Amino acid sequence: AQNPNCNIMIFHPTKEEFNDFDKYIAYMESQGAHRAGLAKIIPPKEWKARETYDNISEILIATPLQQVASGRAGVFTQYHKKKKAMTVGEYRHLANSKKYQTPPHQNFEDLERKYWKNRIYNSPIYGADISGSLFDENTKQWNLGHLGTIQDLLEKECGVVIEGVNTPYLYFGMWKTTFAWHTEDMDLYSINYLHLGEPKTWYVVPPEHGQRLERLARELFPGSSRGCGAFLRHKVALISPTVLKENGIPFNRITQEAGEFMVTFPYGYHAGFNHGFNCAEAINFATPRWIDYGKMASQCSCGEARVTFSMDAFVRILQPERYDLWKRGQD
Ligand SMILES: O=C(O)CNC(=O)C(=O)O
Ligand SMILES: [Mg+2]
Ligand code: NI
Ligand SMILES: [Zn+2]
């Protein structure tokens, strides 16, 4: 079995290998990359996402989210308070202000220590989940707005045509902005490109060990667990690496820098934080190997998770027994 310790693998495709996206995902899996839950892909030196980032300041963040924490430094939840709209240029200035800027630090490890020690005492503002793309239309390789759609993959694999669309999302981050422990909707893959700015640190649990994380989470968030049998779908719970280590949960960590892609694999729980002002782009995708994970994905039916239009068909076709209850949670 390849990669039996489930280490995060890093790939350096040539420009020739960068032509066929599906083929390269399958290659990475042939080397055991999925066992980690997360892989890094460094694009060939010839490639670029677009010519410059000099003209992005007028993009609107219609609903910036202030991420307010509750709990203890290593075990907390966050809720999102909606703030007034602002442009990317306004948000960048905010991120660089004395109140929100990255503190002085020695290296990524020192910054990680400061994040875990101090996150809860601050409420950073995240421009998340903004529909759109920063890939130039002329970028033909690994353009996250030009991937094969998940609806077309389900149709190719299973023969059933379904409604729905699949488009990318932009994330504008600042110091301490945080992504809670989660898997993707329907345990899909995700791909994330860090277009510009400061790094993003990721933590990930191997898919084969995801239920160990879930059991810890039920212990650490016991009211939430009674409220919902899949509460990590709410995307609000954080658990630090120190706490994970104390409880014997297998995980890995890696820092993504500007110009790098990350791929999350089906049922790979992940969480992380931004180091400073940055912009990422991400989208879900599927492969044939995903179908079995989609059929087994947990679902939130308590009403909290509320998701896209396109998840309807996935539930309806892959999980018909769950469909009625899940849809009640959507309505
Ligand atoms: O970058 C973020 O805030 C969160 N991104 C992801 O969970 C992802 O790409 O799957
Ligand atoms: Mg602009
Ligand atoms: Ni994700
Ligand atoms: Zn729920």
Ligand 1 neighbour 190 (Cβ under 6 A): yes
DSSP structure string for 231-276: GGGG--EEE-HHHHHHTT---EEEEE-TT-EEEEPTT-EEEEEESS
Classified as helix, coil or strand, 185 is: helix
Classified as helix, coil or strand, 109 is: helix
Which residue's CA lies nearest to atom 2 of ligand 1? 179
Cα(287)–Cα(119) distance, rounded to whole angstroms?
36
Mutation to probe ligand 1, out of 238, 264, 274, 285 (largest number of atoms < 8 A from CB): 264
Mutation to probe ligand 1, out of 65, 171, 235 (largest number of atoms < 8 A from CB): 171
DSSP structure string for 11-26: E---TTTTS-HHHHHH
Type of residue found at 210: G
Cα(238)–Cα(215) distance, rounded to whole angstroms?
14
Type of residue found at 289: R
Is the CB of residue 119 less than 8 Å from the CB of residue 176?
Answer: yes
Classified as helix, coil or strand, 181 is: strand
Helix axis angle, 320-330 relative to 311-318, nearest 10°? 150
Is the CB of residue 114 less than 8 Å from the CB of residue 201?
Answer: no
Determine the atom of ligand 1 nearest the C-alpha atom of 128. Answer: 3
Nearest 5°: phi and psi at 120?
A: -60, -20
Cα(310)–Cα(113) distance, rounded to whole angstroms?
39
Residues 6+ apart with CB under 8 A from 8: 36, 38, 39, 40, 204, 252, 253, 254
Tokens 């948000």 -> residue = 91
DSSP structure string for 202-230: EEEE-GGGHHHHHHHHHHHSHHHHHH-TT
In this structure, the number of other CB atoms found within 10 A of the CB of residue 137 comes to 10
Angle ∠(310,142,112) on CA atoms, nearest 5:
85
Name the DSSP letter for residue 176.
Answer: T
Is the CB of residue 78 less than 8 Å from the CB of residue 95?
Answer: no
Cα(175)–Cα(119) distance, rounded to whole angstroms?
9
Which residue's CA lies nearest to atom 4 of ligand 1? 179
Mutation to probe ligand 1, out of 65, 78, 129, 192 (largest number of atoms < 8 A from CB): 192
Bridge partners for 127 per DSSP: 172
Which domain CATH number covers 136? 2.60.120.650
Instruction: Please check if 146 is assigned to a binding site.
Output: no
Determine the atom of ligand 1 nearest the C-alpha atom of 184. Answer: 10
Ligand nearest to the CA of 300: 4
Cα(179)–Cα(223) distance, rounded to whole angstroms?
21
In this structure, the number of other CB atoms found within 10 A of the CB of residue 47 comes to 15
Q: In what order do the strands lie in the sheet with 9-11?
A: 9-11, 38-41, 261-264, 189-197, 278-285, 169-173, 125-131, 65-72, 75-82, 237-239
Q: Which two tokens stand for residue 48?
A: 């670029």
Cα(264)–Cα(33) distance, rounded to whole angstroms?
10
Q: In what order do the strands lie in the sheet with 252-256?
A: 178-182, 269-274, 200-205, 252-256
Nearest 5°: phi and psi at 286?
A: -130, 160
Q: How was this structure determined?
A: X-ray
Domain, as residue range, for 156: 1-331
3-state helix vs strand vs coil in the chain, percent to 5:
30, 25, 45
Q: Which two tokens stand for residue 330?
A: 């959507």
Q: How many CA atoms lie within 13 A of 118 on its CB side?
A: 13
Classified as helix, coil or strand, 279 is: strand
Ligand 1 neighbour 301 (Cβ under 6 A): no
CA of 6 relative to ligand 3 center, distance in Å: 18
End-to-end Cα separation, the chain, in angstroms? 44
Cα(204)–Cα(274) distance, rounded to whole angstroms?
15
Is the CB of residue 283 less than 8 Å from the CB of residue 167?
Answer: yes
Cα(270)–Cα(149) distance, rounded to whole angstroms?
23
Q: Which two tokens stand for residue 168?
A: 């990318």
Ligand nearest to the CA of 171: 1
In this structure, the number of other CB atoms found within 10 A of the CB of residue 34 comes to 28
Resolution in A: 1.5
Single out the residue of 65, 179, 66 nearest to residue 115, CA to CA.
Answer: 179
Number of domains in the chain: 1
Is the CB of residue 18 less than 8 Å from the CB of residue 142?
Answer: yes
Q: Which two tokens stand for residue 180?
A: 């809670």
Bridge partners for 68 per DSSP: 79
In this structure, the number of other CB atoms found within 10 A of the CB of residue 224 comes to 18
Ligand 1 neighbour 192 (Cβ under 6 A): yes
CA of 169 relative to ligand 4 center, distance in Å: 23
Ligand 1 neighbour 171 (Cβ under 6 A): yes
Q: Which two tokens stand for residue 321?
A: 């027994």
Single out the residue of 236, 246, 119 nearest to residue 182, CA to CA.
Answer: 236
Cα(202)–Cα(40) distance, rounded to whole angstroms?
11
**Helix H segments across 136-221?**
150-158, 210-220
Ligand 1 neighbour 180 (Cβ under 6 A): no
Helix axis angle, 311-318 relative to 150-158, nearest 10°? 20
Type of residue found at 94: L
Burial class (CB in 10 A: 0-12, 13-18, 19+), 321: exposed
